Structure formats: structure tokens, C-alpha cells
């Protein structure tokens, strides 16, 4: 961790390890650890972090994630599209902000 400049793929394997045990709240901390290390976010990182906001119901976490995909102009995966439609139904945050 401290010695090697790890990749977003190296951070992604820690995200998939946390989500396999039901650590969806802890999997979002890996995304905050990747952001603190200066490693940029790839579309496979947004695919698994938006899935971690489904079970954790962290709608405020996915508010910063969805605004970051539009500013960086990434293509959204099919697993990331359904993750945004579920959280926009529960929290109703896309309808009051007009972001689709």
C-alpha cells in the first residue's frame, strides 16, 4: 500500500473483496482511499462503487459519484445504469436536481 503506487485495478480488487463479504459500507472507504492517493477513477471503479451504494443505501455518496461521471465524461456501464435508477427511485435525488 505505502510503498507501491497501486492502480485503480489494484483498488478494484479490494472493492470486490469488500463487497463479497457484505462490506458495502467498507467498500466505499476503498473509493475514498483511492481518491486520497491521487489514483483517478475508471468506469469499472464507478461500476462497483455504485453497486456498493445499493445495499448500504448511501445516496449522499452516490451523489458525488454521479456528478463525477458527467464531469469526466465516462461511459456508464449497464450495471451502473441500474444502480442509478434504483437510488433515484428511493431518494428522489435526480428528479429534484434535474440530472439524468
Amino acid at each position: 500500500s505505502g510503498k507501491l503506487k497501486l492502480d485503480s485495478i489494484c483498488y478494484l480488487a479490494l472493492i470486490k473483496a469488500k463487497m463479497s463479504r457484505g462490506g458495502y459500507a467498507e467498500a466505499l472507504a476503498v473509493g475514498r482511499e483511492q481518491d486520497a492517493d491521487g489514483v483517478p477513477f475508471l468506469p469499472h471503479t464507478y461500476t462497483h462503487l455504485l453497486e456498493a451504494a445499493e445495499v448500504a443505501d448511501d445516496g449522499e455518496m452516490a451523489l458525488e459519484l454521479a456528478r463525477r461521471m458527467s464531469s469526466e465524461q465516462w461511459p456508464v456501464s449497464d450495471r451502473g445504469r441500474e444502480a442509478l435508477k434504483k437510488l433515484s427511485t428511493r431518494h428522489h435525488w435526480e428528479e429534484v436536481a434535474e440530472y439524468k
Binding site: 510503498k3 507501491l4 503506487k5 491521487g38
Partner: protein
């Protein structure tokens, strides 16, 4: 000396008594001439006005010229209201251009009036802006001229050059370009100087392409570029860190443009050569260019030439270039050019690169004498002087003396951290090179502690703790951003610690994220870190770093190539250790396998030796068997130690920390010898004979020959002894030449180059019997101990035995408590200002001046305090030295009263308060 001018004034009055506040020498000569008692060898002041003229001539030979420049551009830039009005007019011209139209030009509110032209401008040679036809363009030119009259200009070809240059030096490229286009459209022609004022924006910004586009634009409009345009192009390439391009522009301007260079051309060329790292010959090219400017061109070097030359000469740590810098500074002060902050900064830069803290402290003490205040960069290069002094400690002489260099490192740290505490106490804004110099100091102290004292792990831990404290918290404390040098020092620290992954991580974080171009030194660090590491592929990665140096314009020096070859040949040992450890682990695994399979139990039975006996051959005849050796011999014990001891694979289970086999340190060596049944006589490296410390023995072995001879003798024939016949090969000439070499060494002992030898048995047996009795009753090893035994008879015990050195305490004189004696042992007094030292010493009306501080201001104040008579001065020199051999006794006899009053009136004032 590093004395403050307050302490210099105190020492001046202490040297001169009450005569310093009396009449001067000229007044004494005037009184001796008026009274008539003047000797013949004295020069009489016969005329006042002619002696005044003589002194004015002799002082006018050193009187400085006036180098102050009344720049109209800087005066326009300091005028905020005129700059805001020019920005308003430029924004109005850029957003909407006026209409070059006849009457009814009052149709818009953008260009209101304030209180046939196209052929009128062509017939009578009048520009279009100078003709008022009640237009929007005429009202715009009237408003522009009305604003330019307020800043001091004239609305001409030369005034608009100042306008465009003053806008361009504050950003504002499009605004100045719009004003230029409105000027060129309204008859005021686009001269080369207006193009120069346009190019000043791209030169200050550093944009090469905009400056070259302006050069091609003024070439396309039929204007030949003069020397100012090539000067701004050279400054554009200088600001964009393209230093040989300045010399290329100078060469092509001489060749193709046919323009003879001015002195500013030489100034920009020397400024570019001061930072040029494209080739190796920048310093001799600058020396030859200065010589060609002075001798061939006939130009006289002013302060910019001397500054650009001394800044380049201060970078070379060769003593001839430092001597050239000192002679150039002395010629500068001799020719009527006084020293300023840049001159003292160049002198501190020249003195810091050799590690001379005394010269830097002398320059810092001389700088506050003339009233020149010390900036922050002088303290940064003083910290760098401490760095280079820690670098250039001769550690081999400390190894001969068995002295640790640790208190010198602690003093060098404490002085610079005292400077860091000084710069936060004066309210100065913290700069990036000061924190970079502190980080360089701590990282270099950590590297030197790892190199010189590797067994002191707590010292390296404290140095790494201070380095990580500076790297992690200090840069974020003063809101500073790290740069190429701050990454360079920390990358050098991580590369010396062989932390390759963290160094590469910070390297690619510097390159990719912060887009910083790494310097040549931090490329050399990544080269030598992979070269020194014995892992596979370090050479292949060092060549990748070499390719990255080659294709990015980084200079590849031949010293780098020779050091690459030397470091690779040195790290061949580490490579061979890491290669042998793999075979060691293979043999360990094979031994652990075959001791469980049990093939050695079947191989231990010598059935072939039982069937084929030692006395019977394969056919059955009797063969000759060698006789058995004695078991008390060395070879029989060595074979028994080979057979009975443990195996080579059972010594260590795991290997070393970094790829190497265990056994390099002495703990693992002693443990392996304990497993082999050997108690080693040399437990640590203190019990190592170290034949590199010998001085007399290699001197004897070089000239004459081996003095031992029988040191390496196998069977009695490899001994080097003189012949038995005599002559030049006999014993007498060899012993005579050995005695001559020992006489040279004893002459070196007498002159103080070598330490005093201890008392030998041959030396003691030839002495006077009373000296032998004193030695045997005192136990003295050196004759210095015998001199201490004789000159201090009350020091010994009752049995005549000598007491240790710690049981004696000499008398401390009070004269070491003086101000100039306290500033010499402070080690922070050259880095303190006059006000801080005057606050620390007195903090009363006596040291307060009421702003310039110097020695003569204190003398002029204390003279008026003496004649009033609020200051009482003792008559005669209270500080006496140099005249009589007993002068410190007369000095202490004149200072008992003042020191006793200083130490006794403060308890008297305390007991006067009636506690």
C-alpha cells in the same frame, strides 16, 4: 571576526579608553601646530581648503556613479488610477471598435465628445489620430490622449510604447494588442519599439510561439527588427528555460542581421550562460565572453555584468573560480560600485559551495555593518553552507582519532534550527527554498549518519523523524507547495535507504500528477539506486532512466558515465551475493529433503572402503599406504573440525533481509561460530586490527622494503632479510635507512603533524633514573602525563599515583563573560540583526537608537553621552593585549570593578525592593 557593530563599538571603546571620545588625530595635530610643539616628521595642516580639495580628489576616485533609472514605465505601473483608466479604454476598444466616419459620430455613448480627413492625412503628413473630425475614433483618441496626459506621456510614437509595455508587464496581452491596433489604424505607425512593447508580454509570460509570431508579423509588415526585438526574443527564450537559444540568437544576429551587440546583449548572454546546462563548457565560454567584451569590444563592465558573472562563478567549487569571484567583487568595490544584497548573495553562494561557514558568517557580519539588511536567501544559502560543511568533514581523520562526528552534526542541526526559529520571530513570510534547505540539511544528515555511523540506529531514527517531520508537516504549515528540489532531496534520501518502490512512487507522482520536470540530480539518484541494488534488472532500469535523460534534453556528463561504470563494478559484489543466496536456498531445500529421505544414512556406510581396503587393491596385491600424521598437529585438527562439526546447511534457516545470505554482520558470524564450536576473539569491529591506520609501517614498506621479512614464510625461504656479507645490501645500510625514515617520522612528530608517542621500554631504560622513578611511581603512559605529574604536584594521590583527568578543574576567568567574548561562542550571532542583539544585551536607553544601525552611530551617541556627562568612561585601555606578555592579568585587573558591580547591583536592587 563575527562581532556585532554594538559589540564592535564596545570593543572599540574598551581598546581606546577615554581617548576615543576626546579629540581626533587631526585635532591633536591642529593643537600641536597652534601651540608650536610639532615635530619635523609630522605633516603640518598648513591649509584647510587645499587639504579639503586633496581629500575630495582622493575620495572622488572612489565615488560611485548614479545607476538609478527613472523609468517612465514603472511610474505608470505604480499609478493605479491611470492604469485603471488605461484598462477601461482598452476594454472599450477591444469590445467595440470605433467608427472611422465623418460627422454625427455622437450616435453612441461609448465614445462621447470631450472638451475629408483621409486625404488631409495624406497631403500634409499628419496622422489620422491627430485630426479631429467629430468621430467615434476621434473621441476615442481624445480620451486616450487625455488619460495618457495624466500619467506623464505625450500620445506619440514613444508614449504608446510605454503604454503598451506597462500594460504588457501586468498581463493584459489582448488589451495592449487592441491599443496597438487602434494606434496603427489611426496613423501612428507600427514601429519596431511598439512591437517590442508587444513582445514584452510574451517575454514575461515565457511564450516562445507568440514572440516568434510577433517577429514574423513585424517582418511581414516591412519593419526590420532592431536590437530590442532580438533582446526581447532572447529574454523570451530565457524565461522559457531555453538557454542555448539565446546564444543562437546572438550568433545569428551578428551573422545575418548585421547588428553589433550592446552591453545588454552581453548581460542577457551571461545570464543565459549562468543557467546553461546544454554543454559542459558554459563557464569557460562565459569567461571568454567577458574577456572579449572588456578587451576587444571595449565595453566597461557595470553592475549587471559583474552580477551575471559572479552568479555564474559562485556555482563552481573550484578554488580558482572562487578566487575569480573574489577578485571580481574587489574590482567592483574598487571601481566605484558599492556592494548590495545581490553582491553579498553571490559571495555567500561562492563561499557555501566549498562548505566554508566562517566565510559566510564573515559576509553576514560585514553585511550588517554597512546597514544592508539580510534577506531570506542569505539565510537559505547559510543553511546550505552548513550542509556542504557537513558534507566535507574529513571523516578519516576522525576515524584515526576515534572521535564520533555526532556532536558536529548536532551543532549543525541546532544552528540551522535556530535560524528557522529566527525567521519566524521576525515576522518574515516563509519561502520555499528555506524549507527546501532545511529538508536538504536533514536528509543529508541522515545520509551521512547512514554512511559514517551505521551501528547507531537511534541517530538515524531521529534524523529520519526530523526529515519526515519537515517533509510531511512543515510544507503544509506555511501553505507551501513542493517543487523539483524538494522532491529531489527526498528522492535522494529514499534512494540512499534502498527504498526503491517508494522512490519510484514519488518519482511518477511528481512526473504524472504535479507535471514537474525532474532535475539531473534526481535522475542520477534513480540511476545509482537501481545500479547499487543487486537485484536482477537494475541495470536494465538504469538504462531506461538514461534513455529518459537522453530524450528529454537532460545533460549526460562523462562523469556520470564513469560513475555508472564504477558503481556497477562496486555493486557486482551485491549482485554476486544475491545470486549465491539462491543456490544456498536450493542446497538448503535439498539437504532438508535428503535428510528425511535417508540417503545419507545409506551413504555413510563405506562398503567400498570395506571391500576395497586401504592396503589391498582391486586385484588383491599389497599397496603402499601413507603413514598417519600426529593427531596433535594443526592439519589433523582441521580435518577433525571438518568432519565432526555441523553441516553448512544447518547454520542458518532463513536468509537475510534483502536477498543476501546471513553472516555479513558480526552477530550472525558469532552465532555461526558458536554453532561450529568456536568462541571468536573478535566479537565486534572495535577488536579489529585495521592495518589502514598504520603510518610508519607502509612508509617503511614502500621505500626500503618489508621490515618483518619472516611474516610470510612457508618453509623458511620466503623471508626478506638483508645479506650477511655487508656492503650496500648488508644490515648496516638497511638499518641506517630505516633509522632515517623513523627520523623523518619523528621530525613530523616534533612539528605537530603526528601525535606524541607513548613511553617505550627502550626510551624509559635510557632516561635519567629520577625520571624512571617518577614514571614507575606515577604510572604515566605518555610524557604529557609526566609533565602533568610534575607541573601539578597537588593532583597526585598519597602513593604517588596519578589522578585521572576529570578530577582537575581550572580557574574560569570572568573576562570570558564579555559581550564580544559571548558573541564568539554564540553560533547564532551572525544570523541575528542589530536590534535583536541590542535587545538581548541591554534593552535600555543606552543601546536604543532614535533607522540605520552601525558602529559609528553608537560611537557618536556615546560621545555625546560622555560629554554631558551621563556616560562615564575609564581612562586607559581596559582591554590590553599584544604589548606585554602579561596582558590578560592587566585586563582582568581593569575589569574586576565593573564585573563585580554588574553581578552585585542586581541583588542590591532586588533587596532594595524589600521582599
Amino acid at each position: 571576526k563575527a562581532l556585532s557593530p554594538y559589540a564592535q563599538a564596545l570593543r572599540h571603546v574598551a581598546l581606546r579608553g577615554a581617548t576615543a571620545f576626546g579629540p581626533g588625530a587631526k585635532e591633536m595635530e591642529l593643537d600641536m601646530l597652534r601651540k608650536g610643539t610639532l615635530p619635523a616628521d609630522y605633516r603640518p595642516p598648513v591649509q584647510g581648503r587645499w587639504d579639503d580639495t586633496i581629500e575630495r580628489w582622493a575620495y572622488a576616485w572612489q565615488f560611485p556613479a548614479e545607476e538609478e533609472q527613472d523609468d517612465i514605465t514603472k511610474s505608470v505601473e505604480r499609478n493605479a488610477s491611470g492604469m485603471q483608466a488605461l484598462l477601461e479604454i482598452g476594454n472599450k476598444l477591444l469590445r467595440s471598435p470605433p467608427s472611422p466616419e465623418p460627422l454625427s459620430g455622437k450616435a453612441s455613448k461609448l465614445y462621447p465628445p470631450v472638451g475629408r480627413a483621409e486625404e488631409l492625412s495624406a497631403k500634409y503628413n499628419v496622422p489620422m489620430a491627430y485630426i479631429d473630425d467629430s468621430s467615434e475614433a476621434s473621441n476615442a483618441s481624445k480620451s486616450l490622449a487625455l488619460v495618457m496626459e495624466d500619467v506623464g506621456l505625450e500620445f506619440t510614437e514613444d508614449g504608446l510604447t510605454v503604454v503598451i509595455s506597462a500594460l504588457s508587464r501586468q498581463g493584459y496581452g489582448t488589451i495592449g494588442r487592441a491599443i496597438f491596433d487602434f494606434a496603427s489604424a489611426m496613423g501612428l505607425g507600427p514601429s519596431a519599439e511598439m512591437y517590442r512593447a508587444l513582445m514584452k508580454y510574451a517575454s514575461r509570460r515565457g511564450d516562445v510561439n507568440e514572440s516568434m509570431a510577433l517577429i514574423e508579423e513585424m517582418k511581414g509588415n516591412g519593419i526590420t527588427p532592431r536590437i530590442g526585438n532580438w533582446h526581447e526574443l532572447m529574454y523570451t527564450f530565457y524565461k522559457a528555460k531555453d538557454y542555448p537559444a539565446v546564444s543562437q540568437i546572438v550568433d545569428n544576429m551578428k551573422m545575418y542581421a548585421n547588428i553589433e551587440p550592446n552591453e545588454v546583449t552581453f548581460v542577457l548572454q551571461l545570464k543565459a550562460l549562468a543557467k546553461d546546462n546544454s554543454q559542459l563548457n558554459s563557464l569557460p565560454e562565459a569567461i571568454q565572453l567577458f574577456d572579449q567584451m572588456e578587451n576587444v569590444y571595449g565595453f566597461i563592465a557595470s553592475r549587471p555584468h559583474y552580477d551575471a558573472m559572479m552568479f555564474h562563478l559562485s556555482q563552481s567549487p573550484r578554488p580558482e573560480m572562487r578566487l575569480r569571484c573574489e577578485e571580481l567583487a574587489h574590482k567592483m568595490e574598487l571601481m566605484g560600485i558599492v556592494w548590495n544584497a545581490n553582491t553579498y548573495l553571490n559571495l555567500i553562494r561562492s563561499a557555501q559551495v566549498v562548505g566554508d561557514v566562517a566565510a559566510v558568517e564573515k559576509y553576514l557580519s560585514r553585511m550588517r555593518e554597512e546597514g544592508i539588511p539580510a534577506s531570506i536567501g542569505h539565510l537559505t544559502w547559510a543553511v546550505q553552507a552548513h550542509v556542504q560543511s557537513m558534507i566535507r568533514i574529513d571523516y578519516d581523520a576522525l576515524k584515526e582519532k576515534d572521535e564520533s562526528p555526532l556532536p558536529t552534526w548536532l551543532e549543525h542541526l541546532e544552528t540551522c534550527f535556530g535560524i528557522y526559529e529566527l525567521v519566524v520571530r521576525r515576522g518574515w513570510v516563509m519561502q520555499l527554498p528555506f524549507v527546501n534547505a532545511l529538508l536538504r540539511l536533514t536528509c543529508q544528515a541522515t545520509i551521512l549518519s547512514m554512511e559514517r555511523t551505521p551501528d547507531e540506529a537511534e541517530t538515524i531514527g531521529r534524523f529520519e523523524e526530523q526529515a519526515n517531520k519537515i517533509w510531511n508537516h512543515t510544507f503544509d504549515e506555511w501553505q507551501l507547495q513542493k517543487d523539483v528540489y524538494s522532491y529531489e532531496c527526498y528522492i535522494a534520501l529514499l534512494a540512499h535507504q534502498q527504498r526503491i518502490d517508494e522512490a519510484e512512487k514519488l518519482f511518477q507522482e511528481m512526473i504524472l500528477k504535479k507535471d514537474l520536470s525532474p532535475s539531473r540530480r534526481t535522475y542520477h539518484c534513480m540511476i545509482f539506486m537501481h545500479l547499487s541494488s543487486g537485484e536482477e534488472g537494475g541495470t536494465a532500469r538504469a538504462l531506461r532512466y538514461l534513455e529518459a535523460m537522453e530524450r528529454a534534453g537532460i545533460q549526460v556528463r562523462p562523469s556520470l558515465l564513469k560513475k555508472i561504470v564504477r558503481v556497477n563494478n562496486a555493486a557486482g559484489y551485491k549482485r554476486d551475493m544475491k545470486r549465491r543466496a539462491r543456490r544456498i536456498m536450493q542446497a538448503r531445500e535439498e539437504y532438508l529433503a535428503r535428510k528425511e529421505e535417508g540417503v545419507s544414512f545409506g551413504e555413510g556406510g563405506k562398503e567400498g572402503a570395506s571391500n576395497q581396503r586401504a592396503d589391498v587393491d582391486a586385484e588383491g596385491n599389497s599397496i603402499l599406504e601413507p603413514l598417519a600424521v600426529s593427531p596433535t598437529s594443526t592439519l589433523a585438527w582441521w580435518e577433525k573440525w571438518k568432519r565432526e562439526t555441523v553441516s553448512k546447511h544447518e547454520l542458518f534457516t532463513e536468509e537475510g533481509a534483502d536477498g543476501t545470505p546471513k553472516g555479513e554482520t558480526f552477530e550472525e558470524k558469532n552465532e555461526a561460530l558458536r554453532m561450529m564450536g568456536i568462541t571468536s576473539s573478535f566479537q565486534t569491529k572495535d577488536l579489529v586490527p585495521q592495518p589502514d591506520r598504520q603510518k610508519l609501517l607502509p612508509l617503511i614498506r614502500r621505500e626500503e622494503g618489508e621490515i618483518a621479512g619472516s611474516l610470510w614464510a612457508m618453509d623458511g625461504g620466503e623471508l626478506s632479510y638483508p645479506k650477511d656479507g655487508g656492503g650496500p645490501q648488508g644490515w648496516g645500510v638497511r638499518l641506517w635507512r630505516e633509522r632515517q625514515l623513523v627520523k623523518r617520522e619523528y621530525q613530523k612528530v616534533l612539528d605537530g603533524y603526528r601525535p606524541v608517542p607513548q613511553l617505550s621500554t627502550l626510551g624509559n631504560s635510557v632516561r635519567t633514573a629520577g625520571d624512571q622513578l617518577d614514571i614507575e611511581r606515577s604510572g604515566a603512559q605518555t610524557p604529557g602525563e609526566l609533565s602533568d605529574y610534575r607541573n601539578f604536584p597537588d593532583n597526585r594521590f598519597d602513593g604517588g599515583q596519578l589522578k585521572p583527568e576529570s578530577e582537575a578543574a581550572p580557574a574560569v576567568p570572568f573576562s570570558a563573560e564579555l559581550v564580544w567574548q559571548g558573541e564568539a561562542n554564540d553560533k547564532l550571532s551572525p544570523y541575528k540583526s542589530d536590534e535583536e542583539i541590542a535587545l538581548e544585551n541591554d534593552n535600555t536607553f543606552f543601546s536604543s537608537l532614535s533607522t540605520r544601525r552601525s558602529k559609528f552611530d553608537y560611537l557618536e551617541k556615546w560621545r555625546d553621552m560622555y560629554r554631558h556627562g551621563t556616560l562615564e568612561v575609564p581612562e586607559g585601555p581596559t582591554l590590553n593585549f599584544g604589548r606585554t606578555p602579561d596582558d590578560h592579568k592587566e585586563t582582568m585587573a581593569a575589569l574586576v570593578r565593573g564585573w563585580y558591580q554588574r553581578n552585585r547591583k542586581e541583588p542590591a536592587s532586588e533587596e532594595e525592593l524589600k521582599r
